[PDB]
Amino acid sequence: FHLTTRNGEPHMIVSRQEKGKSLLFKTEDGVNMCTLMADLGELCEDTITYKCPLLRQNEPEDIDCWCNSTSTWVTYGTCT
Amino acid sequence: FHLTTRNGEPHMIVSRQEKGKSLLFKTEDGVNMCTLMADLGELCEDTITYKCPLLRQNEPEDIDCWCNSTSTWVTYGTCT
Amino acid sequence: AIVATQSPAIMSASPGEKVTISCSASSSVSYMYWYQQKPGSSPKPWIYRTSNLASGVPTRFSGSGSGTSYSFTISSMEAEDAATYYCQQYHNYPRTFGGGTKAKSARADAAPTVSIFPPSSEQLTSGGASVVCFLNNFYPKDINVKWKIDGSERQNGVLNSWTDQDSKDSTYSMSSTLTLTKDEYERHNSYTCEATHKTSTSPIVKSFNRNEC
Amino acid sequence: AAQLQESGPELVKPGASVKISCKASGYTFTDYFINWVRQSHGKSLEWIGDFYPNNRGPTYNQKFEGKATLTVDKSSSTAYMELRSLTSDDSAVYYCARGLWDAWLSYWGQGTLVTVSAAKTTAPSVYPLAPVCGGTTGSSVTLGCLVKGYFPEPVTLTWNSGSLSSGVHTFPALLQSGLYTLSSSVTVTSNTWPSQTITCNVAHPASSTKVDKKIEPRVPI
Amino acid sequence: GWGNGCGLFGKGGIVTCAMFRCKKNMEGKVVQPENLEYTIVITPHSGEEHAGKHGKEIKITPQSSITEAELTGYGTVTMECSPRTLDFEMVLLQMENKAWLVHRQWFLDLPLPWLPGADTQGSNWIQKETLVTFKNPHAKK
Numbered sequence A, B: 001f002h003l004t005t006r007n008g009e010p011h012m013i014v015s016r017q018e019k020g021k022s023l024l025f026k027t028e029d030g031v032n033m034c035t036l037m038a039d040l041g042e043l044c045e046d047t048i049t050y051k052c053p054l055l056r057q058n059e060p061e062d063i064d065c066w067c068n069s070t071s072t073w074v075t076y077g078t079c080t
Numbered sequence C: 001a002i003v004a005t006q007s008p009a010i011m012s013a014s015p016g017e018k019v020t021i022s023c024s025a026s027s028s029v030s031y032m033y034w035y036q037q038k039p040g041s042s043p044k045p046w047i048y049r050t051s052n053l054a055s056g057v058p059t060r061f062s063g064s065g066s067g068t069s070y071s072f073t074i075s076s077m078e079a080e081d082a083a084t085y086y087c088q089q090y091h092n093y094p095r096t097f098g099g100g101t102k103a104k105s106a107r108a109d110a111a112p113t114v115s116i117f118p119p120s121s122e123q124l125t126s127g128g129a130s131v132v133c134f135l136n137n138f139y140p141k142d143i144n145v146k147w148k149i150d151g152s153e154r155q156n157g158v159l160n161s162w163t164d165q166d167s168k169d170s171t172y173s174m175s176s177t178l179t180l181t182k183d184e185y186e187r188h189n190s191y192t193c194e195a196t197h198k199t200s201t202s203p204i205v206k207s208f209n210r211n212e213c
Numbered sequence D: 001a002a003q004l005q006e007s008g009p010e011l012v013k014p015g016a017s018v019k020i021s022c023k024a025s026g027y028t029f030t031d032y033f034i035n036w037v038r039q040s041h042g043k044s045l046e047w048i049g050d051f052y053p054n055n056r057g058p059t060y061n062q063k064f065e066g067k068a069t070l071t072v073d074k075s076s077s078t079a080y081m082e083l084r085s086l087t088s089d090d091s092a093v094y095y096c097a098r099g100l101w102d103a104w105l106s107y108w109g110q111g112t113l114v115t116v117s118a119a120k121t122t123a124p125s126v127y128p129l130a131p132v133c134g135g136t137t138g139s140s141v142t143l144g145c146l147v148k149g150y151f152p153e154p155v156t157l158t159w160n161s162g163s164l165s166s167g168v169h170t171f172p173a174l175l176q177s178g179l180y181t182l183s184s185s186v187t188v189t190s191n192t193w194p195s196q197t198i199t200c201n202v203a204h205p206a207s208s209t210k211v212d213k214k215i216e217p218r219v220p221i
Numbered sequence E: 001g002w003g004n005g006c007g008l009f010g011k012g013g014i015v016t017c018a019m020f021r022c023k024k025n026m027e028g029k030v031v032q033p034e035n036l037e038y039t040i041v042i043t044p045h046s047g048e049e050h051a052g053k054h055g056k057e058i059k060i061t062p063q064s065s066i067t068e069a070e071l072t073g074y075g076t077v078t079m080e081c082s083p084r085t086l087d088f089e090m091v092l093l094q095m096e097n098k099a100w101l102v103h104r105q106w107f108l109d110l111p112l113p114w115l116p117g118a119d120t121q122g123s124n125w126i127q128k129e130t131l132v133t134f135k136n137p138h139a140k141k
Helices: none
Strands: A002-006 A009-013 A023-027 A030-036 A042-052 A065-067 A072-079 B002-006 B009-013 B023-027 B030-036 B042-052 B065-067 B072-079 C019-022 C034-037 C043-048 C061-066 C069-074 C083-089 C101-105 C113-117 C128-138 C144-149 C152-154 C158-162 C172-181 C190-196 C204-209 D034-040 D045-050 D068-073 D078-083 D098-100 D102-107 D125-129 D140-150 D156-159 D168-170 D174-176 D179-189 D199-204 D209-214 E027-029 E038-042 E056-060 E067-071 E075-079 E090-094 E099-103
Touching: A009 A023, A030 A042, A030 A072, A042 A065, B009 B023, B030 B042, B030 B072, B042 B065, C019 C101, C043 C061, C043 D102, C069 C083, C083 D102, C113 C190, C113 C204, C113 D140, C128 C144, C128 C190, C128 D140, C128 D179, C144 C158, C144 C172, C158 D174, C158 D179, C172 C190, C172 D179, D034 D068, D034 D098, D034 D102, D045 D068, D125 D199, D125 D209, D140 D156, D140 D199, D156 D179, E056 E067
Parallel strands: A009 A072, B009 B072
Antiparallel strands: A002 A009, A023 A030, A030 A065, A042 A072, B002 B009, B023 B030, B030 B065, B042 B072, C019 C069, C034 C043, C034 C083, C061 C069, C083 C101, C113 C128, C128 C172, C144 C152, C144 C190, C158 C172, C190 C204, D034 D045, D068 D078, D098 D102, D125 D140, D140 D179, D156 D199, D168 D179, D174 D179, D199 D209, E027 E090, E038 E056, E067 E075, E090 E099
16 A cells, blocks of 8 residues: 555555555554555555544444554555 | 355354455355445444345446355445 | 745753744644654654654654644753754655754853964965864854955855764854955965954954054 | 665766665565755755655655656665756755655655855865954953865864863854855963963865964064 | 354445446527627628628617617617517527427426536536446445
């Protein structure tokens, strides 16, 4: 995935071949591990973009993306 | 995931932590690799169960699950 | 696309005093930083976000703010504080610094010792002539030097150089050098450097007549 | 164990270009931003660049758009900054700091000095500065030494070969038409001079010169 | 709530936006009685043959002045016309080269995204929600 930013915050452009794998990227505050559980398809015009909240010792609820060290934005296409 | 059977055929009970990762399980006919692209959430009462067809050198169409050596059934919850 | 504007450019302080250093951004950011830079050293991070200490930062430093305002606070100054300190923003592209705040040690006021030096005979072979005033061991750093030639102020050709604050006595020293052509130098008799400083109600005046002994 | 290792100091002529390296270690190079940082002598820091080594996206400070060109080699975990059409204002340090998610420079390099100069190597003129003719009143006396017209920095100025070190003020050099000038003062009690000798010594390594100037009382015309 | 990054359980504010790109539109026009253009052919009744001898064709508007039409060989004929009774609170709807005459206030009430006639951007559509549906939201998407 391509690591960029959205208003100072890290942003992940996730491609199709990353479905099912732990997303890791270094940050001043250590290594960040986001988990993507998404309709994740091929990167195209039909993108969706939203935030993966920070979750410390809390079970996830009503979400398919979350990181454990620093909240991150994520973007991926839905095409197939 | 828990590997069981459904009428002689292999059945995969897939949990939340497996979203995005290649599903591999040994079978008399070699190693089987199913690909799960699913609303895949937490295992709960709201399950859905269906079949992942065998696909030999054919692109997938209108499906989010398929194996490449032996057709497999899959089950997962949608809760979050 | 945003400036950051940091409030004292300087800052005198004594050990134990509680310094505060503000940072003012031209639009609302939440990602700032305060670095610290020592005279012959890299900058180091000291604050991160708007209030996170970096690991291996003394709890003497604190950071607080929001809504375009941002404020470093040094809660009881140590000798090892004395430095520049440096806001950033890292909330929009072109990441910006502030213009830096220069916290330096302080002491009782001290008048400069002023000495004036005509051009050396060796320099006067050259066609240039430098008249030097040394203004030594003074505090505070703020000082102004005015040069005169035969009563007329001369501003062009004046070069001033300051030492860093002395590590032992906390004073400053300055050289002020008036450079003119040798031809002009030998057409005048009186040369004066006048030092305005808070330790005297009128400037200290050092002057010589070129042709006198 | 995070480290950034810059290249070593560079001279250079105006109109030249330079090519500063950055060598990261102790972290995933791909995972974090790489940020150049000008600081001119007696100015603040000045952000320049930012380069994400996963995908080689730059940004630029507009002020340095056209001046700089950032690039990374993944394979060597190295970042590079070119600077092009160098001018005297480009004389500065250039630090490479890694970011950590946000724009926060959490690890710096040792800093590359770049020093844009015409000037050719020139030994200083060294001038002894005795007090005003006829001397001064008071129990102490101040002497001077003026070091004019040299390039490059540094010089090493001493008094009495370093045996006279107290009471000395040696001022930072300033540029004067492309050449450096500095001065030094020494203050001694008046029983010490001129009855005993005081000499300014100035070494200029680049020209291999070492000059001594004894301070001699002025006399009338 | 705790499951999605919040300290408290309760309702939170969420907002969603999507770029709207029109791919096919229709436009309704208003026909003014004036600016209507009638074509009239004036043919000399001579009996001459053909199988190069067209009658003079002239186009006029209820706002144009008296016409002086020249008929090669015979001189000119002068005439003036009036659109003497055709209605236009109506509108003419155009759906890709095929049009219809529709009543106003019906055209204006159509539940579809629209743009004031004098536009050229074709981007700033009004009431896009008419062609958009927002599903029930989730904590973050």
